[PDB]
Amino acid sequence: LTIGQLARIFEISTKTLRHYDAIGLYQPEQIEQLSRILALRRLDVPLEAIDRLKRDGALDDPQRLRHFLQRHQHTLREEISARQRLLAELDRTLATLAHWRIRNMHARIVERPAFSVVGMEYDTIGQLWERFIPREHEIAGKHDPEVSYGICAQQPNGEFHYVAGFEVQEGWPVPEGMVRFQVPAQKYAVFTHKGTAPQIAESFQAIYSHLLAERGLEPKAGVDFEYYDQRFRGPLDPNSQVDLYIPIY
Amino acid sequence: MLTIGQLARIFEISTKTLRHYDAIGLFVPGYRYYQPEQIEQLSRILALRRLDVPLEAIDRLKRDGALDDPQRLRHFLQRHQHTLREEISARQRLLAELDRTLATLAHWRIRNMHARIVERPAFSVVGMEYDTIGQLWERFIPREHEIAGKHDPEVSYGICANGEFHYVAGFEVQEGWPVPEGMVRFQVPAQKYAVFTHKGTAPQIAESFQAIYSHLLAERGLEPKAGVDFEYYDQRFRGPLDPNSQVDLYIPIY
Amino acid sequence: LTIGQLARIFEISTKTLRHYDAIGLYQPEQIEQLSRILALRRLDVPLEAIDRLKRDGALDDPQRLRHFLQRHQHTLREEISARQRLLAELDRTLATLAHWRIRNMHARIVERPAFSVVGMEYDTIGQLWERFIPREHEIAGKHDPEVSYGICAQQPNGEFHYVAGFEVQEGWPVPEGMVRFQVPAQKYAVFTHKGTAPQIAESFQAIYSHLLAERGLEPKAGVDFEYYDQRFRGPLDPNSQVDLYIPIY
Amino acid sequence: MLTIGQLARIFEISTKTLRHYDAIGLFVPGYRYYQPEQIEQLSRILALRRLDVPLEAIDRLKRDGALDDPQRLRHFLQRHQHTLREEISARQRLLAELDRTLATLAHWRIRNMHARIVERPAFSVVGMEYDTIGQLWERFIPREHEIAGKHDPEVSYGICANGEFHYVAGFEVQEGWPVPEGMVRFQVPAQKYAVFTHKGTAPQIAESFQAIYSHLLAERGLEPKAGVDFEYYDQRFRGPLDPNSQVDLYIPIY
């Protein structure tokens, strides 16, 4: 077979072989050497080793190589084993994160009067976010358009409720499918959450378990909401930071 | 002291979920008031359903040990830990022997590959040229009914030809009709072939290709000639990625 | 060939072919049809499934069993991913339990007079006991034979030290190899360890971290020690606990 | 505030390791005492060389950012944990690639075996009958000398035969000698064989033995008769798990 065509498949290179000359390195047995090699190019063996692997021995001896390429498998799975126990280490090292996460989450006491939000009202609370943010600038009378609230009122049933909306001047028309919620005048303990939305809840568990009791604050069955703003870049980006406004006495 | 709706906001759950949890005697608390100190003893539940563990083996733990004994609740999940890895460890060895059985069904037919001998005269085939099968066969299908002079339109040719490839996807033609742009036409000469019927997909014929030239010619007893190889896509072929396909590979012979 | 020969090669039972009689499941064509079955049943499949999955077929036909076996790889593989995710979370879950026992690691203040310990002493720590426990009743005149002590004198260089001994009435001879150490009188804060031996240092940072400071104690550079009584049956059994006696002012 | 000695102690490390760390300016705090708030900073530094993170990567993570900010190091760790499982995955699909070459290795000799044709008369040999090879293929060797009337001593046999299995690893003997105890004798009759000098190991034969009755007799055209087959050890054989040794196998032929 000629030199130009003996470049089988599928990505060359031709001098691939001319390379494979120098002091080293259509016969039918002048292939299985290449066949074995080609993967090989799946183990990444230097060539100089792949010369040592010439006739001293061996030429072919698929005999040896069956134990050889699983002796490796022994090495390469020990490589996988070492990096997995490194990974298992990691998953535990990423626990010291959560509880330093929280011990630094300080509370600031904020009193804010009654204001009026307009937005969409509630299976999930994320969805509304999926559904609402094409309807952003459909609302006029904005104080600050960057901030948005995730209102949650405690009904005497008791069962959920949430509204994704914006603080707006009261007196403007509300679009179809939206609702006007009037947040009353409350005074809040504000926690800065630094994480994603599903682990906002595990911050809520830290609040109502001890983080309020270490500063002597008592929780209040009022209107909880989370303060979104410019320091917010995604619900599952583990770098967003929100403020959780939690009512107190 | 908190209420059933605040815990729902805390845990992202249903009020019926806890109203059910009260009925069993699991997590009890008209004035339903829960203690903030038992918020963890609950999350030490809502962390086990997330580990599909049934909801009365818990309630059996609640009084053997253990739900409230923290040195006991890591023994239980470290056993569930190692249970899951051995499940994973079973199924990763399931995967190891899942591949070694994707090579022996590889090389089974390759041996059982059928072979005809056809000597075919020189013919002309117009088409497009040169990244793989599909990089040239879609930019064709919409340009196959604009080709005139076709001998058989239900057969297509994939020609294999300094030393670079000259792969041409085209149609056998009767001469005297012209070729569009930027189509080309290739002179395939009169030669003798070993046609091997391949039953599979486009990525896995290139192993059907090195198999012949490997030991398949010899064992069949024929010698390769330096000419022009090519694949033959008959009717019997239905898509380059359909596995139940059937193509032909024509290989020059001395 | 015979129903004998038909019973060779594969690690086969006679019950398996009496099995396959009235089910519907003597020529070298019946050699791979019955060899792909010992190829999936190597991957935990059903059987009656692949019954008529071969009277349609494929009987053999490896064009299909390709997508199928890659189908099955998917399925598996999905399983293996799904259960790593559980282990990942599952790790995270053992954090809380880590701290719940730390938060419940109460200090005890204990004043103990100067007592006499003798055993072995010293670039490692854990290998010291496997040589000593054998030599355990060599020692004579011990107060409580059940309690070992892992002493760690504080040297002022600071070079370590460490002794694994018993407490005996002074004046008893001391087997070759071991020495006698006198710890002085001190008052200590005692923290009970629930866990294993490489976990012991995990408590040592928490103690010298915040656990002394909230309890309003100051620690003093002296002779600390680890105390093993029964409630200890293995440096790896995770249910033994050791009382870490730390000096305080 | 603390002492270099008890610090070290609580981290279960050495003191020269902390004087290691100080000299650079990394963890820099004659009576140098350190405050306890630097403990958790070191439980985060010592937790990074368990990840084999260079001891300079950091420091630049020190006065730059960011070693003690709990959300921008979960970033770090999140990446590093990606490329860690990205490296798993490389290999993890590579040892799916090799572990699928576990069959390609095979068939190449299997196709390039050899088969002589022998006709042999009935013989006899004895040892122990039927726990695999090694559970019997080893009791012996200390009992090879008990037999007398060895025919060729460099040659050992493993016979296979209402119906089930029936191995026996013997030697060929001239008749008229005492067979030990509880050793026994076996008589294979005069029959037709084809000999495949396998070049592998003893666990490796069971599918080379599977290959020959599968198709190799049909390719070579031979056919088997309901008799007794066996395997032949010679100067060839070197070890039951020795790869490079070649062993021969006798199967009945018509």
Side-chain angles (χ1 to χ4, degrees):
Chain A
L1 202 292
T2 196
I3 75 155
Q5 310 277 327
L6 201 214
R8 281 71 149 306
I9 51 192
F10 192 176
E11 264 77 43
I12 57 285
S13 150
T14 49
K15 13 187 68 246
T16 308
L17 312 116
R18 181 133 52 140
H19 188 198
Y20 295 68
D21 163 3
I23 45 196
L25 146 35
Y26 50 54
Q27 186 89 40
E29 195 123 358
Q30 263 193 8
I31 181 207
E32 206 55 36
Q33 291 180 355
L34 292 212
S35 317
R36 352 187 19 262
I37 293 203
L38 174 151
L40 201 287
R41 156 117 229 311
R42 268 146 122 186
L43 187 269
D44 260 313
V45 185
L47 280 159
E48 67 264 19
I50 289 54
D51 177 302
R52 288 188 301 202
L53 282 182
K54 202 97 140 72
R55 298 171 283 108
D56 205 9
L59 193 149
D60 42 2
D61 253 28
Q63 249 214 93
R64 294 179 233 176
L65 332 196
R66 172 67 180 270
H67 154 276
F68 142 75
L69 65 84
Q70 172 85 317
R71 235 358 79 141
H72 247 102
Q73 163 137 357
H74 171 81
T75 80
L76 264 83
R77 213 160 33 159
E78 284 301 322
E79 282 175 0
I80 293 170
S81 315
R83 303 170 153 72
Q84 190 39 24
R85 73 174 53 100
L86 286 183
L87 277 179
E89 207 280 346
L90 268 200
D91 301 24
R92 294 194 339 281
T93 310
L94 290 155
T96 297
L97 295 284
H99 307 109
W100 170 26
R101 207 178 74 60
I102 292 164
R103 104 173 193 250
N104 188 156
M105 197 166 59
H106 282 181
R108 293 305 200 216
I109 279 102
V110 182
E111 300 157 68
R112 206 164 101 143
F115 54 93
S116 150
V117 160
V118 196
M120 212 145 289
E121 165 249 310
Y122 178 99
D123 298 320
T124 90
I125 72 101
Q127 228 277 188
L128 292 62
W129 290 111
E130 307 257 306
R131 174 222 333 295
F132 200 60
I133 316 161
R135 329 210 45 198
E136 294 170 77
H137 320 78
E138 313 220 311
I139 300 162
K142 323 300 319 313
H143 172 108
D144 288 343
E146 293 259 76
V147 296
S148 171
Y149 306 75
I151 309 295
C152 172
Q154 298 290 319
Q155 281 87 12
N157 286 322
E159 178 121 77
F160 214 64
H161 173 89
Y162 189 105
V163 156
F166 301 76
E167 201 195 310
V168 283
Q169 207 181 19
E170 194 166 303
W172 280 88
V174 317
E176 321 258 359
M178 291 188 187
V179 81
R180 183 155 223 118
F181 191 94
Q182 290 258 356
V183 182
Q186 308 212 32
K187 97 171 272 202
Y188 304 99
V190 171
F191 297 117
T192 284
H193 185 29
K194 299 184 154 150
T196 87
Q199 65 180 181
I200 286 183
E202 72 178 2
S203 294
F204 269 153
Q205 323 173 164
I207 303 330
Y208 292 102
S209 208
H210 57 92
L211 284 182
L212 286 174
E214 329 176 322
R215 301 209 22 200
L217 315 151
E218 273 276 321
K220 204 183 181 293
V223 172
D224 184 316
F225 64 96
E226 41 216 42
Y227 181 60
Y228 302 105
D229 65 298
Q230 310 72 343
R231 338 178 306 273
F232 180 73
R233 314 191 241 111
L236 305 179
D237 180 12
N239 306 295
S240 62
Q241 85 158 15
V242 313
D243 271 356
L244 297 133
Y245 270 56
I246 289 165
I248 54 170
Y249 284 99
Chain B
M1 163 153 44
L2 309 140
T3 188
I4 199 162
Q6 285 167 344
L7 268 70
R9 181 76 203 275
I10 281 161
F11 286 151
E12 315 233 23
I13 72 173
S14 63
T15 298
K16 180 262 143 188
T17 285
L18 205 178
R19 278 195 242 262
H20 185 201
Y21 285 174
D22 185 5
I24 295 114
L26 188 61
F27 189 47
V28 337
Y31 284 147
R32 310 288 302 160
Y33 278 116
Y34 286 125
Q35 208 102 268
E37 309 62 7
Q38 55 186 0
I39 278 182
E40 26 151 38
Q41 182 146 41
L42 208 200
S43 176
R44 274 203 279 284
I45 288 201
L46 299 308
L48 293 202
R49 335 200 313 106
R50 298 204 91 245
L51 293 166
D52 317 300
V53 179
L55 268 43
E56 273 262 352
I58 44 113
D59 219 325
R60 167 190 49 55
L61 275 177
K62 255 192 151 213
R63 188 113 185 84
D64 216 335
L67 191 34
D68 294 342
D69 196 322
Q71 78 161 339
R72 190 155 280 179
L73 217 63
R74 149 167 178 150
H75 178 78
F76 176 66
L77 315 183
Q78 271 194 347
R79 285 210 340 279
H80 198 277
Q81 201 242 316
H82 159 246
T83 295
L84 282 175
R85 335 208 304 274
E86 254 201 19
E87 294 207 327
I88 284 168
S89 303
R91 311 166 189 282
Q92 51 179 24
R93 305 179 330 241
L94 273 275
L95 287 179
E97 213 61 27
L98 176 296
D99 237 349
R100 78 87 162 266
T101 91
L102 264 149
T104 320
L105 55 160
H107 297 87
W108 172 67
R109 84 118 208 57
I110 279 79
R111 63 160 222 102
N112 282 49
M113 195 178 228
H114 185 22
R116 252 182 32 180
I117 296 265
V118 175
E119 290 169 90
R120 188 196 186 120
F123 57 99
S124 272
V125 80
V126 305
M128 287 190 284
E129 64 172 1
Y130 276 112
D131 274 0
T132 202
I133 303 164
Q135 258 77 64
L136 178 51
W137 296 78
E138 288 290 326
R139 333 125 69 180
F140 201 70
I141 318 169
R143 284 191 91 201
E144 81 171 2
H145 67 122
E146 281 110 10
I147 191 111
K150 259 147 94 171
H151 200 286
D152 200 9
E154 184 44 288
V155 316
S156 322
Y157 291 97
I159 299 168
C160 287
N162 176 309
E164 305 86 337
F165 290 154
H166 195 271
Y167 188 83
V168 179
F171 268 107
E172 180 139 89
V173 302
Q174 198 223 321
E175 324 187 63
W177 295 83
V179 64
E181 68 171 2
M183 301 247 203
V184 284
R185 200 189 35 229
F186 200 61
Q187 265 169 81
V188 200
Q191 34 176 197
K192 187 172 139 221
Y193 313 125
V195 335
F196 281 128
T197 303
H198 174 170
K199 312 221 199 191
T201 86
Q204 67 169 166
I205 73 191
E207 266 218 347
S208 259
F209 208 70
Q210 268 189 0
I212 35 188
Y213 294 176
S214 51
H215 56 280
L216 282 174
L217 276 181
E219 289 171 357
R220 287 268 198 181
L222 293 125
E223 215 154 318
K225 192 201 93 234
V228 173
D229 332 64
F230 66 71
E231 306 108 60
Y232 182 75
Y233 304 130
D234 208 295
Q235 194 261 21
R236 317 164 309 166
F237 148 116
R238 308 147 292 168
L241 315 166
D242 173 352
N244 189 334
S245 267
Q246 214 178 334
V247 307
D248 287 78
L249 274 84
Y250 287 27
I251 288 122
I253 290 318
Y254 271 65
Chain C
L1 72 155
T2 59
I3 286 42
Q5 313 341 328
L6 224 145
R8 153 117 270 253
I9 300 208
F10 284 149
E11 316 319 7
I12 184 143
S13 147
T14 52
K15 208 98 216 77
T16 70
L17 258 62
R18 310 296 296 162
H19 222 70
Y20 310 154
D21 200 320
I23 289 201
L25 188 62
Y26 299 96
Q27 210 72 249
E29 51 204 299
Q30 194 95 299
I31 204 66
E32 195 130 26
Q33 163 178 356
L34 301 208
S35 168
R36 290 180 174 89
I37 300 179
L38 202 294
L40 303 165
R41 249 309 198 139
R42 182 156 335 147
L43 310 164
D44 266 292
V45 307
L47 287 72
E48 230 266 37
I50 310 142
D51 177 343
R52 68 155 28 232
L53 152 62
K54 75 156 179 62
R55 209 167 64 183
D56 37 49
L59 202 173
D60 301 321
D61 295 53
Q63 83 281 27
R64 79 174 85 260
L65 278 76
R66 176 94 181 231
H67 194 71
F68 154 49
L69 217 47
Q70 285 186 354
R71 260 297 167 195
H72 191 275
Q73 171 175 69
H74 198 23
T75 87
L76 274 140
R77 177 155 251 152
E78 262 190 329
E79 323 210 310
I80 301 89
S81 173
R83 314 161 182 257
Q84 280 124 85
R85 323 195 266 242
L86 286 157
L87 287 159
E89 184 271 13
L90 175 39
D91 224 331
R92 131 187 350 138
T93 310
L94 291 177
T96 310
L97 296 179
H99 302 126
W100 182 33
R101 61 135 200 117
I102 281 170
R103 84 182 50 141
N104 248 43
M105 223 198 345
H106 285 184
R108 263 43 172 154
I109 310 280
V110 177
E111 294 198 277
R112 275 181 25 159
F115 54 94
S116 183
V117 84
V118 89
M120 207 114 15
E121 146 219 349
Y122 186 115
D123 291 327
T124 182
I125 292 101
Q127 316 193 244
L128 272 79
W129 292 98
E130 72 180 2
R131 25 171 142 166
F132 174 25
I133 308 297
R135 319 229 40 217
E136 210 217 293
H137 275 203
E138 212 129 287
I139 309 283
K142 40 186 143 228
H143 165 217
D144 194 284
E146 165 65 64
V147 198
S148 355
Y149 282 77
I151 310 291
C152 161
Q154 270 297 306
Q155 294 287 334
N157 318 144
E159 162 156 319
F160 289 80
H161 188 102
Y162 182 89
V163 177
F166 278 47
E167 139 153 335
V168 240
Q169 151 162 33
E170 194 146 353
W172 271 110
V174 307
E176 57 301 5
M178 23 212 219
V179 74
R180 152 162 314 182
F181 187 78
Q182 311 274 281
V183 317
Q186 308 165 114
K187 157 138 101 145
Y188 319 93
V190 184
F191 294 79
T192 295
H193 195 60
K194 316 261 184 122
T196 69
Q199 283 211 301
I200 287 178
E202 190 162 17
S203 293
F204 263 105
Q205 318 116 331
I207 290 180
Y208 282 92
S209 6
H210 58 258
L211 285 182
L212 290 174
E214 343 172 305
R215 182 75 199 268
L217 308 175
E218 276 270 9
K220 136 177 235 324
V223 160
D224 28 338
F225 65 88
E226 299 146 17
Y227 186 94
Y228 306 112
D229 38 353
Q230 297 54 331
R231 314 166 247 124
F232 174 79
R233 319 195 212 69
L236 275 154
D237 166 3
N239 267 36
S240 52
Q241 10 143 171
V242 311
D243 301 300
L244 305 181
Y245 275 50
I246 85 166
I248 55 166
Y249 282 99
Chain D
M1 77 208 219
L2 317 167
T3 170
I4 309 78
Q6 34 190 1
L7 221 163
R9 203 245 138 113
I10 46 141
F11 279 131
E12 211 170 355
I13 59 169
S14 181
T15 69
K16 199 62 179 176
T17 308
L18 200 136
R19 339 185 204 262
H20 199 59
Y21 296 168
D22 181 337
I24 305 107
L26 157 81
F27 176 161
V28 52
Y31 282 124
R32 336 154 79 71
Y33 295 125
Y34 303 135
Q35 53 194 353
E37 298 89 6
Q38 303 166 349
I39 288 176
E40 223 195 349
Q41 186 178 2
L42 262 68
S43 142
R44 271 160 18 210
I45 291 176
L46 271 81
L48 285 181
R49 198 222 97 259
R50 319 152 104 201
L51 299 173
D52 301 329
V53 164
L55 233 96
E56 218 216 46
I58 291 196
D59 188 316
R60 37 76 135 235
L61 269 193
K62 158 168 125 180
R63 271 126 153 140
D64 152 292
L67 168 50
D68 290 312
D69 176 312
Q71 75 144 358
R72 92 148 102 154
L73 181 134
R74 53 121 23 110
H75 177 60
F76 168 119
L77 262 173
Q78 101 168 304
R79 296 285 57 116
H80 202 285
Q81 131 125 11
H82 204 189
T83 87
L84 270 184
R85 45 229 294 194
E86 270 186 0
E87 309 194 337
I88 274 328
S89 350
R91 291 164 166 95
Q92 243 203 1
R93 64 172 167 263
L94 200 172
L95 269 89
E97 165 288 319
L98 262 56
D99 286 26
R100 94 168 254 175
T101 203
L102 285 291
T104 296
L105 280 298
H107 347 269
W108 181 62
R109 39 129 195 151
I110 302 185
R111 283 186 287 101
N112 197 337
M113 279 262 242
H114 193 81
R116 294 153 18 172
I117 293 294
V118 174
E119 33 165 26
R120 161 201 295 249
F123 46 148
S124 275
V125 77
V126 87
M128 303 144 252
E129 65 177 5
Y130 157 85
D131 176 325
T132 166
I133 276 73
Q135 273 108 57
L136 223 69
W137 241 89
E138 254 174 21
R139 323 149 48 133
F140 205 77
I141 288 86
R143 315 247 322 239
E144 60 87 18
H145 60 89
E146 270 186 69
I147 291 170
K150 281 117 226 186
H151 191 287
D152 194 8
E154 301 254 290
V155 179
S156 34
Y157 302 147
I159 180 118
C160 321
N162 160 24
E164 199 240 304
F165 202 31
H166 195 333
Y167 207 84
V168 197
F171 265 81
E172 184 184 6
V173 301
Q174 34 194 98
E175 318 169 72
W177 289 97
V179 46
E181 253 239 337
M183 283 204 184
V184 66
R185 96 207 307 209
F186 194 56
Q187 320 249 88
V188 44
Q191 62 196 190
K192 239 310 202 157
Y193 321 116
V195 13
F196 294 129
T197 169
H198 172 338
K199 323 194 153 174
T201 87
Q204 197 150 24
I205 70 165
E207 289 178 319
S208 173
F209 193 75
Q210 162 193 358
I212 55 104
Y213 290 154
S214 148
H215 58 96
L216 282 103
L217 310 186
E219 330 185 330
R220 305 201 121 240
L222 336 142
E223 162 183 358
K225 334 174 52 153
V228 162
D229 50 293
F230 66 76
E231 187 201 330
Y232 178 96
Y233 304 93
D234 198 78
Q235 183 184 359
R236 319 281 188 88
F237 184 62
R238 305 182 341 153
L241 309 146
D242 181 290
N244 38 13
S245 51
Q246 31 177 0
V247 311
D248 299 32
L249 293 112
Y250 289 33
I251 1 94
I253 270 51
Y254 263 104

